[PDB]
Amino acid sequence: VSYANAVSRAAPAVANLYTTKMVSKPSHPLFDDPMFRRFFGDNLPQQKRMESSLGSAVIMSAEGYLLTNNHVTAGADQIIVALRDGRETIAQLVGSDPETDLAVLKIDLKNLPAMTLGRSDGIRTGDVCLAIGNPFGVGQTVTMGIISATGRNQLGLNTYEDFIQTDAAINPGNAGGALVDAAGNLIGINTAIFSKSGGSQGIGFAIPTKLALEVMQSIIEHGQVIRGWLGVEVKALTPELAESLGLGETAGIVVAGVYRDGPAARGGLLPGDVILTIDKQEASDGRRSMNQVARTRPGQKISIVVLRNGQKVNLTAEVGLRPPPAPAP
Amino acid sequence: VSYANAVSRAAPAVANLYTTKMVSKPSHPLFDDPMFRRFFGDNLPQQKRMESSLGSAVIMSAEGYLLTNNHVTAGADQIIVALRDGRETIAQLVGSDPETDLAVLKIDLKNLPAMTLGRSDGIRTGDVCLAIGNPFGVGQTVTMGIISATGRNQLGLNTYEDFIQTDAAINPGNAGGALVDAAGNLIGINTAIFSKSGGSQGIGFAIPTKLALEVMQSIIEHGQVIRGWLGVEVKALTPELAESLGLGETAGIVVAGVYRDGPAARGGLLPGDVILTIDKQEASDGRRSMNQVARTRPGQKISIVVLRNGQKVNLTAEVGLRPPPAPAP
Amino acid sequence: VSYANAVSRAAPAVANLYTTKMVSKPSHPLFDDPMFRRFFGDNLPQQKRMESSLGSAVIMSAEGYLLTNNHVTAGADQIIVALRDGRETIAQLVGSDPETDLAVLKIDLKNLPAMTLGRSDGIRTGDVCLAIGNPFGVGQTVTMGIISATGRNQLGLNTYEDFIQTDAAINPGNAGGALVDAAGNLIGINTAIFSKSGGSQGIGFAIPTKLALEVMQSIIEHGQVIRGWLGVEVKALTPELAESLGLGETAGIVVAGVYRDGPAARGGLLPGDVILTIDKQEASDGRRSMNQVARTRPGQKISIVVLRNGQKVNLTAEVGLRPPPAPAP
Amino acid sequence: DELRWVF
Amino acid sequence: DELRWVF
Amino acid sequence: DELRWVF
Prior knowledge:
The PDB classes it as peptide binding protein. The entry lists the keywords complex, peptide binding protein. The assembly is hexameric. HtrA-type protease AlgWS227A with decapeptide. Chains A, B, C are AlgW protein. Chain A is α+β, with helices and mostly antiparallel strands. Chain A folds into three domains: about 5-105, Trypsin-like serine proteases (Thrombin, subunit H, Beta Barrel); about 120-220, Trypsin-like serine proteases (Thrombin, subunit H); about 230-320, Pdz3 Domain (Roll). Chain A is built from seven helices and 21 strands. In chain A, strands 1-3-4-7-6-5 form a six-stranded antiparallel beta barrel. A six-stranded antiparallel beta barrel of chain A has the order 8-9-10-13-12-11. The radius of gyration of chain A is 23 Å and the shape is globular. By secondary structure, chain D is an all-beta fold. Helices cover about 0% and strands about 45% of the residues of chain D. Chain D is built from no helices and one strand. Chain D has one strand at about 5. Chains in contact: A-B, A-C, A-D, B-C, B-E, C-F. The interface between A and B is medium-sized, with 24 and 27 residues.
């Protein structure tokens, strides 16, 4: 069989990213603690221009919005977009979302191809898929495998995860590019690999379209991703403390820590309490409730029920805006 | 096209293995010869609990028998089996066979899915196949390639070999899992890779079903694999010694060594003789005859013809039980 | 689906290569500058017999011509060819072409299978393809992926490049073997990988049939590849020097250097001139014109127009034979 | 063990 | 060379 | 930059 028609449909909508960045940190034998004390003067941190360079990006719409990974563009001073046809432009960064490793770009160009979107929820483990990006800077290349698994969360790459896992060969330089189904429709943004060698060993991960679209639409509208904030640190419940409360494995979440000055604080959430229901929804898994607070919009008064002094107490908080992560990519 | 229906048929019958083992050997800078002489006392070997952990296993029958690799469970103190549905049990080891790198497990559970068995002898190089296991502990993942070759013996992994070779991505954590054909039927137990990097480079090996079933059925019946024992060490024949005997390249096998006290010894097999026929079958390849003795059952009187003092002599031995390999996995 | 019929059609025409070579250079801790001055005498360079060994080769015709990579056989003292059926012969080297990394072999044997040739120009990115060779010396193995891209030049592997890029697993030992399409017809000679680990990461390159045939036919006829020689070193033109001439981005090629005694020299080509047209063809890309001179036959008078002293001048050269590359593989 | 989610 | 099988 | 082709 052949997938050249899928390649023809989607490939023109996948672009190459070249990013440059000025940096104050060099090769690590030099410029360390030893430099300034290895019989040598302080002198000056010489800031080199390093090239994140190889990446990829998907042309989401004809108006010139590009999707990609945050870790490719974070910190860039310049982003060059190179189209399959050979056109080049410098892009501007509409906005980023480090917690899902996604970025939105804009270019001013017309006669721009756009990716047909598939439906992430409709993929099944076993479906053939194709990966399109710029491995090792060799040029746009297409690789082929199958959906290995779906909804991989708990990888620990980013704080909000719903990864597709693909067999197809994904290498450094594929980040940002398209994961596409046999028809040629976008089902993911290729993001991460698990390797022992720095190159593809057949364990690759893409962000599914459903999550990507939702992030991109919020960035275009508000320049940001809007997420609910409660301000609480929470840890799981075990049988061992299931008993101590006297009422056991109701899916409890333990309020280990409450952000000082937060909306949960401001609503009288207290350290050492126990959360039974968030917004009339039972709070069992820390992930579960953390994602439910993320989707709850800021400005929404919600009810929270907590087992505190051994008796249910009913509180109310006003969900706030979630603050950015700041330093890391 | 898509292989999601095959994945749906077989995936539920592939499980994840987590094994723990207590060990007396630690990281090798410490506890070596230097420890006890590096200005330090003998103290005590501290035995750490190490996790062979990631492996996989195939649910051979509804009654709860699991197949897997010996090297995953050898030496384990505890084996946890985790089912695709999320159920968990501790398994017991029915019995192992280091010489084919296979182990049989038993769990007590019902409503258990079972793998439909394909026919190993019917696969042809070129057929698509799927690999199911737990690479890197990421979760059950399905990978896809083609049968690259068949009947790979002489790899030197184990003493009895008949390996299928597959393109599909096999990594640490896939050992024990299923190799499956496009329909979704078991054709192998994934066992070994050849890599320069510790991860899949597309050279993977699975034990074919035909051999696996035969090993598993013998383990369930007798707790052991029953193999013929002759007690002889044998080396090949070359033209150079073809002449010295005066009768050349009759496929001879040279009796380099005879186990002392063995059934070949007890039948008057002698070092430096020459074996022309084992059990009225001509003995050409050392592998050939070693596999023929393995399949001959213990307790079977057989005839052996040897060129000793330059004239054929007819001996008779009673095939014995083959003794285990003991130390290595 | 299955590709076993393609494998059956082409696999018998792919052979294994084992080459041995005597070498004067050993392991590099020893025999270096330190050896002869590390309190030790000069003694003698001991020349070891090293085995390029694993490679592959395609049986181009029933008369016994084999195609393969130059880097597998270059320098070999003996080349053993091992056929899929198990036959073995020693081959002779008809001739090599280091600049495309191709070699032609001859064996004297009959009842020889031959590879059906596909059409390199007809492949499209997305087509399934199969790779046949001897990875790691494990035996003939078939691997499967898709055409990832086409006409990869500028990789820098060899001076004349037109590489197919394939997903399918290519490892050390695959060089020389067949890249084949879903029908089973030769579309390339597998040649190179880009890896971070020395093993397949899904970035592999094959020489396309069209180029391979053309090289092989010239070798069989003349023992050599016949290429046009101009004897010039040429560097690109930028806007910055586009202006200085006064006439800009006409695709110019700058004659940085003229071989002394060459046909361009002999025709009055001069350093610092500017080439506008080679053989009534405009000379824009250095690659473009270098390939056009390569295809122009030696002995052909051609016209060259150069912007020298700010005014077009018309010269004539007689294309010569291109001299070999000599040392490197 | 103890792992902490934050929202 | 010399390689040894054992049964 | 400066890259050189030779024919």
